[PDB]
Amino acid sequence: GWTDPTEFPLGCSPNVTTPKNGLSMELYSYDYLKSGSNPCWDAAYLDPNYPRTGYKSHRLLAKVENVAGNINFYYHAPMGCTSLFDTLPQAYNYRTPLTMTNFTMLLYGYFKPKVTGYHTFTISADDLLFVNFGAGNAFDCCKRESSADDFGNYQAYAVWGSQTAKDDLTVHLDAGLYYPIRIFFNNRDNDGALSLTLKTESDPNPVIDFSDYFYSFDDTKDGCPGLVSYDT
Ligand SMILES: CC(=O)N[C@@H]1[C@@H](O)[C@H](O[C@@H]2O[C@H](CO)[C@H](O)[C@H](O)[C@H]2O)[C@@H](CO)O[C@H]1O
Ligand SMILES: [Ca+2]
Secondary structure, eight states, X not given: OTXXXXXXXXXXXXXXXXXXXXXXXXXXXXXXXSXXXXXXXXXXXXXXXXXXXXXXXXXEEEEEEEEOXXXXXXXXXSSSSXXXXXXXXGGGOOOSOEETTSEEEEEEEEEOOSSSEEEEEEXXXXXEEEEEESBTXXXXXXXXXXXXXXXXXXXXXXXXXXXXXXXXXXXXXOTTOBEEEEEEEEEOSSXXXXXXXXXXXXXXXXXXXXXXXXXXXXXOSSOOBOSOOOOO
């Protein structure tokens, strides 16, 4: 039950006077197979455990903080089956060129709503985007480090070329709470793309700039369970 994704995800109440803006990010290599191979790309990204522990067998490229803003991109590769260096959008706070054609990316932190009510998050990706959302499902309130690998069934998932290449998740959220979120991305080859949008009833248009929504909090000994609750 604890890590299963739900329509009423659990949020958190960190004790934080001055919250740190943006999500944390980790970038890892995703090397091609030997030049001339067909298939040319490493298939590891489809392994159920690649997003849990497999990516750790790859090279750590960087740890980045303060990922905040519009994180969506479409990277158009000039050639397929070819590693090419380019840059991520500004939101990612990572200015140096990386292999945009082939890389793994993990984001985590907390999502703070602006208006209490239903939130629909929509995702699409090339090649892979797996999203967890809520305490337990993503990780435990102010206990991320100790629960980081224990995420549950994805609230949304998108895999290019599969039967689910676009997805969404609809959750009821309270604007006073901060919700654990985990976003796992992979580009295996060629084009790379990530789209996350948010729809609520308070705006007829989607939200694409998450500047005001993404936070990071330090873990604590006792954790920071949500202090707003409506269940009976
Ligand atoms: C040019 C070549 O030798 N092969 C390419 C393939 O590598 C190419 O790759 C796929 O592209 C899709 C997007 O359309 C997606 O990014 C996959 O991750 C990627 O493997 C495929 C389609 O472009 O066929 C040839 O063009
Ligand atoms: Ca791709």
